[PDB]
């Protein structure tokens, strides 16, 4: 039973354990490439870390477009039919 | 037989004199009553047949076919009354009359004591049949070929036999039959006596009219064609082989090869059929190829198996056409891959699909299996090598039977099809009236084993 806040907490949690991110510039709206200065190779690993976290695969076509934590939260919430 | 002929005739006045909206209620109710009285024919004796008069008789072979024939008419009425709803009253009554006249010819055909009387009624059944399929169908060479290579030679041979023997009464032929000696003229008498029945079975190589006929026919036409009309060929061969011995010893070889190989071919074709009604039609060719083999090797076990196969196939194949018609009446297409995952939308109708498929692949102890098993045992004595062909056919049959079930009932439903309304009581009752008697016959199989029992 996932919830929107529960998903948001876990998405940020995983990013706060990534050494390439400063957990002081990290908000739900931080852009991985424009605000946090990460690579596209880095973004692939972030998406892989989310797949591990929640136990399901995010296809490559959809993965490229998730560039902020909120976009990840929305994708996971939409996939699992979470509405609050 | 007059206790069955006359009430069947009275169905015509009943249909025409009925109130406008009661034609389906009256004809169905009273044809079921006739079917009920048909059980009186099961007064069969161990030694003698039931010989009513100089024209009609009933042995253990014609009795189950008679009961199947009279059971089918009420079922055909239920299957038809939905797609004929928009037809005008007079055309509704003309369609019902065609079905009644077909039953009238059929019951007399299965009980005719004289072979020339059999031949005349045997050909009269085509008049209502062709009218039904053409006038109410969905959308030449075979008529010409069949009459040229089947009907006409049979007439000449029967007339010739009557001149020589002096009679064509079947009881008389049982005592005056003489052996058929080798000669070129007897080879043509043998072929003339059998080709009309082989075309109607149909024999592999002469079978392509059947898938075409089923694709064009309305549901009632397919039901009677698959259940009873094909069995006229089997019944005719079971009778006329009495007077063809011993020449059948070698004349059967080419037709046995066609059937044994045809079994595997038509079963294999069923795997690649894209149209449900064609798939069932080819399935019937495969099943009937077993009946031809059984008739031709003529052993006590093969005749019991042949009789059971003809009855079992009649119910099973008719039920499958009704199941395919229930889908067609919703999606208006015969294509098998169009509507998938129907078990999700129509749960009970999926149960009928399963039961029909299980009988089609001859699950024991269904009479489909009993008949098929008896033929397999008899052909093994004929030649041990045949078991390979029979065994492979059992494998392929299970494949296409379950492929049909899996394609239409399982998987994901088709998104854009949104007119799959719940099954009507009419359709569920129609399916159970095929499968319930079929499964009940497992309790007392002896009544569909024929006179060799």
């Amino acid at each position: 039973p996932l919830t929107l806040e529960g998903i948001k907490d876990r998405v940020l949690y995983v990013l706060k354990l990534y050494d390439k991110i400063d957990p002081e510039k990290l908000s739900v709206n931080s852009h991985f490439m424009k605000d946090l200065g990460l690579d596209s190779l880095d973004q692939v690993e972030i998406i892989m870390a989310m797949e591990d976290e929640f136990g399901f695969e995010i296809p490559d076509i959809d993965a490229e477009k998730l560039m902020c934590p909120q976009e990840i939260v929305d994708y996971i919430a939409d996939k699992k039919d979470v509405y609050e | 037989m007059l206790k069955y002929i006359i009430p069947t005739i009275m169905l015509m006045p009943l249909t025409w004199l009925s109130k406008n909206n009661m034609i389906w209620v009256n004809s169905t109710a009273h044809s079921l009553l006739i079917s009920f009285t048909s059980l009186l024919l099961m007064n069969q004796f161990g030694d003698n047949s039931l010989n009513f008069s100089l024209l009609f008789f009933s042995d253990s072979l014609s009795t189950p076919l008679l009961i199947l024939t009279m059971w089918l008419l009420p079922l055909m009425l239920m299957a038809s009354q939905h797609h004929l709803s928009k037809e005008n009253l007079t055309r509704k009554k003309l369609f019902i009359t065609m079905l009644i006249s077909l039953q009238l010819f059929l019951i007399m055909t299965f009980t005719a004591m004289e072979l020339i009387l059999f031949y005349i009624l045997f050909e009269a059944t085509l008049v209502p049949t062709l009218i039904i399929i053409t006038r109410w169908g969905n959308q030449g060479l075979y008529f010409l070929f069949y009459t040229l290579a089947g009907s006409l030679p049979l007439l000449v041979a029967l007339i010739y036999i009557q001149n020589t023997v002096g009679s064509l009464n079947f009881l008389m032929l049982q005592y005056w039959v003489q052996p058929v000696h080798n000669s070129w003229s007897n080879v043509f008498m043998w072929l003339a006596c059998m080709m009309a029945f082989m075309v109607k079975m149909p024999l592999y190589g002469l079978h392509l009219w059947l898938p075409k006929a089923h694709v064009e026919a309305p549901i009632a036409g397919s039901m009677v064609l698959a259940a009873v009309l094909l069995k006229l060929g089997g019944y005719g061969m079971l009778r006329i082989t009495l007077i063809l011995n011993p020449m059948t010893d070698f004349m059967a070889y080419p037709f046995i090869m066609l059937s044994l190989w045809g079994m595997i071919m038509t079963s294999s074709i069923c795997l690649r059929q894209t149209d449900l009604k064609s798939l069932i039609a080819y399935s019937s060719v495969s099943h009937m190829a077993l009946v031809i083999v059984a008739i031709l090797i003529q052993t006590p076990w093969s005749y019991m198996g042949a009789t059971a196969l003809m009855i079992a196939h009649g119910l099973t194949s008719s039920m499958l056409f009704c199941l395919a018609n229930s889908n067609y009446e919703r999606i208006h297409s015969r294509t098998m891959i169009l509507a998938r995952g129907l078990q999700t939308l129509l749960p009970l109708m999926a149960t009928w699909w399963l039961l029909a498929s299980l009988t089609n692949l001859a699950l024991p102890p269904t009479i489909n299996l009993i008949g098929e098993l008896f033929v397999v045992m008899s052909t093994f004595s004929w030649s041990n090598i045949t078991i390979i062909l029979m065994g492979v056919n059992m494998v392929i049959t299970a494949l296409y039977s379950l492929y049909m079930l899996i394609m239409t009932q399982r998987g994901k439903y088709t998104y854009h099809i949104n007119n799959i309304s719940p099954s009507f009581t009419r359709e569920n009752a129609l399916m159970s009236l095929h499968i319930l008697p079929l499964l009940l016959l497992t309790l007392n199989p002896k009544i569909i084993l024929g006179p060799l029992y």
Binding site: V44, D60 | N418
Partner: protein
């Protein structure tokens, strides 16, 4: 169909996943995953695009030799052990229109809300069709991307079967 970048990133993910299948243990995978990243970081700034394509081609040939014959698959991914497991349980919403009224009367509140959605669908259809006409160049669309709703009160064109799709665990 896919840019050179998209092919390099799709190989990176695929290579890492197959490496995970070999290593199994997380510390071992972490060590070799960093070596793999160092190989992708060696030629990150390759300018000559003929050289870069040759590097990608060799990378994919090396991957084919080194791939796991039985890689890990997420259970609900295509080819996984739970893939399409629940499809038999997804019933389309239009099936509710055929319920007997005695079946409908057990859920009055639900079927009242369902009418509101059906109304919302009917009243929006014409505007959705008009929007797609006036935004579609002559000759039809060149891509499958759909537009958003541009006014207030409009719904994004062709939303019904996305919004009302079955749940992933419908029972």
């Amino acid at each position: 169909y896919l840019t050179h970048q998209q092919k390099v990133l799709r190989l990176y993910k695929r290579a890492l996943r197959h490496l995970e299948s070999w290593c199994i243990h997380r510390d071992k995978y972490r060590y070799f995953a960093c070596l793999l990243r160092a190989r992708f970081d060696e030629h990150k700034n390759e300018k000559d695009m003929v050289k870069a394509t040759q590097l990608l081609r060799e990378a994919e040939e090396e991957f084919w030799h080194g791939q796991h014959p039985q890689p890990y698959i997420f259970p609900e991914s295509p080819g996984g052990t739970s893939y399409e497991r629940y499809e038999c349980y997804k019933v389309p919403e239009w099936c509710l229109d055929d319920w007997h009224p005695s079946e409908k009367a057990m859920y009055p509140d639900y079927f009242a809300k369902r009418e509101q959605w059906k109304k919302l669908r009917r009243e929006s259809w014409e505007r959705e069709v008009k929007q797609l006409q006036e935004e579609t160049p002559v000759g039809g669309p060149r891509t499958e991307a759909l537009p958003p709703a541009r006014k207030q009160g409009d719904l994004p064109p062709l939303w019904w079967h996305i919004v009302t799709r079955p749940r992933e665990r419908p029972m």
